[PDB]
């Protein structure tokens, strides 16, 4: 193609790219607030965590680290903050 | 001139590939350059098949096979009509016939 | 006579087309030499050399003659033809036909100050055939064509009065150096310059004004 708008790519085509190869680079990660079984104790956890994040009230470990996104434990209720 | 883009072997990213011996002349050849064929044959060669089938103590018998992987140097494979010389345009064909 | 077979040949025989600028403007492919010597009756030719080529055979060498011809009229147009033949006279005759078929225009210009008529080329321009590269540089007035003899006669036949030339490669290969110089003067109408920047109304083709003066 020889004529195209480089300043206004479509939303789909920007979502297809790598995070550094977009127009302005930005993270595709996010934060979550996770609530642990029992005590309410909302806590914010990074999406690609690298640490075994636990709530301050009890050892009720909320996520396990993996190569990419953290695996949230099974009885947990998250909202994408 | 350079005759083949692959240098007559298959080696892209090693530097060294440990060699094998030709089954016909005991020449040392790299394993990627060799002419590997796989000779799968019944043992009884289809002319003695009726005589052994009626000579068996068993009915329904298997008539088993021999399996061999033959490794050929370039000289012996060309001399034994396994591969032969092809035209310049027809060297680039990698498919079997 | 001629009894042409092309739409363009019928138009040029009828007198609808009175210049070859219309052919160069609409990029009409010429395939009949009578069009060229009708629309440019004043071009005069010159045969550059005759060298013998040889094909080996069962007993000896089949030999043929290669003749290089340059036609041109001395303001704006040149053609180059090269033909191999069994006979030298056939090679020269057919080379004159081929050289007439390949006639292209030349953009002459000024080295400065636009006072008289255009004496020199408009830009530096290059061409390449084989290893040979010929470059052509605009020269002041009275400089003459500074070139080796073959490409000097080609630039004389184009209508250039003065140009500096630089070569590269096996320039003793005469056919390659003539084709390189031919490409170099063909590129003069290829370079886009600020006087050419303004837009044009894209005129409609003579093949559709005069569409019923074709065969049917």
């Amino acid at each position: 193609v020889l004529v195209q708008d480089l300043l206004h790519p479509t939303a789909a085509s920007e979502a297809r790219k790598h995070k550094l190869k977009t127009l302005v680079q930005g993270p595709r990660s996010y934060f979550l607030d996770v609530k642990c079984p029992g005590c309410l104790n909302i806590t914010t956890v990074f999406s690609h965590a690298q640490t075994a994040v636990t709530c301050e009230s009890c050892s009720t470990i909320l996520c396990t680290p993996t190569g990419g996104k953290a695996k949230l434990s099974e009885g947990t209720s998250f909202r994408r903050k | 001139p350079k005759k083949r883009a692959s240098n007559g072997r298959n080696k892209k990213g090693r530097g060294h590939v440990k060699p094998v011996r030709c089954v016909n002349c005991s020449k040392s050849i790299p394993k990627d350059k060799a002419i590997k064929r796989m000779a799968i044959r019944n043992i009884v060669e289809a002319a003695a098949v009726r005589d052994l089938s009626e000579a068996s103590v068993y009915p329904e018998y298997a008539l088993p096979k021999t399996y061999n992987k033959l490794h050929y140097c370039v000289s012996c494979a060309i001399h034994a009509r396994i591969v032969r010389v092809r035209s310049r345009e027809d060297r680039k064909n990698r498919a079997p016939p | 006579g001629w009894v042409p077979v092309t739409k363009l040949g019928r138009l040029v025989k009828a007198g609808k087309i009175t210049t070859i600028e219309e052919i160069f403007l609409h990029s009409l492919p010429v395939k009949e030499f009578q069009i060229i010597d009708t629309l440019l009756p004043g071009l005069q030719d010159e045969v550059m050399n005759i060298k013998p080529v040889q094909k080996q055979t069962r007993a000896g060498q089949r030999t043929r003659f290669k003749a290089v011809v340059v036609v041109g009229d001395s303001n704006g147009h040149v053609g180059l033809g090269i033909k191999t033949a069994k006979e030298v006279a056939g090679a020269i005759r057919a080379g004159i036909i081929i050289a007439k078929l390949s006639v292209i225009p030349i953009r002459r210009g000024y080295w400065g100050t636009n006072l008289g008529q255009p004496h020199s080329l408009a830009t530096k321009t290059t061409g390449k055939c084989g290893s040979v590269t010929v470059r052509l540089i605009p020269a002041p007035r009275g400089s003459g064509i500074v070139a080796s003899p073959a490409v000097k006669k080609l630039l004389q036949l184009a209508g250039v009065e003065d140009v500096y030339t630089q070569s590269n490669g096996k320039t003793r290969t005469l056919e390659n150096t003539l084709k390189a110089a031919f490409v170099a003067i063909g590129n003069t109408y290829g370079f886009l310059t600020p006087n050419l920047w303004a837009e044009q109304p894209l005129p409609v083709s003579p093949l559709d004004i005069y569409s019923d003066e074709a065969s049917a």
Binding site: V1 | - | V5, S27, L28, P29, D208, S211, A214
Partner: protein, 206 residues
């Protein structure tokens, strides 16, 4: 611009989606094709038939601009389009070339099959590549009944269509013939349909 009777009617849309002209290629897609509208969970893509209608009426405008209608040339070496270009050549002044395009028909001015067209229309650019390749030697525009995976080099107007199907190729040639006769004025009724059935342009087995 156009008087808005040239919009895609529901009758013509019924014809298009009946013939499966929308059913484009497989996930092979030449990158020169923005004509595709979505995709099917199958892996087969869907063509935007509105764009097919707009490209078809543009090609009809291009065909109608030619002064002498014998200067239009229609090519189909595929059997599914031979009857189509013969019927298009019947209903319009165009000369057909059905079957073999002998090379040197656009070049080689002493050949017996020598044409000098002002526009050439092919059925498949891949199979009819000899015609478009010679047309690039003598300054001739090319209109092609393109698919989503066709080799669009030296094609100037590409009408996107399913050129794997029998009914689609014939329907595209039929609609093209109908539109050039409507613009020429042989069919004065722009809104009323044609007495010629689109089934006339179809391939038959023997």
């Amino acid at each position: 611009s156009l008087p808005a009777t040239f919009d895609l009617t529901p009758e013509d849309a019924q014809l298009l989606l009946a013939a499966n002209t929308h059913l484009g290629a497989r996930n092979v897609q030449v990158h020169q094709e923005p004509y595709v509208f979505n995709a099917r969970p199958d892996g087969v893509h869907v063509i935007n038939v509105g764009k097919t209608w707009e490209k078809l009426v543009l090609a009809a405008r291009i065909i109608a601009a030619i002064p002498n209608p014998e200067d239009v040339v229609a090519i189909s070496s595929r059997t599914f389009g031979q009857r189509a270009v013969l019927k298009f050549a019947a209903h319009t002044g165009a000369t057909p070339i059905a079957g073999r395009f002998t090379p040197g028909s656009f070049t080689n001015y002493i050949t017996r099959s020598f044409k000098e067209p002002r526009l050439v229309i092919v059925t498949d650019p891949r199979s009819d590549a000899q015609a478009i390749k010679e047309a690039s030697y003598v300054n001739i525009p090319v209109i092609a009944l393109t698919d989503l995976d066709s080799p669009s080099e030296f094609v100037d107007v590409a009408i996107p269509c399913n050129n794997r199907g029998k009914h689609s190729i014939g329907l595209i040639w039929y609609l093209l013939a109908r539109e050039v006769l409507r613009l020429r004025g042989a069919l004065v009724d722009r809104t009323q349909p044609w007495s010629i059935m689109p089934d006339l342009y179809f391939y038959r087995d023997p």
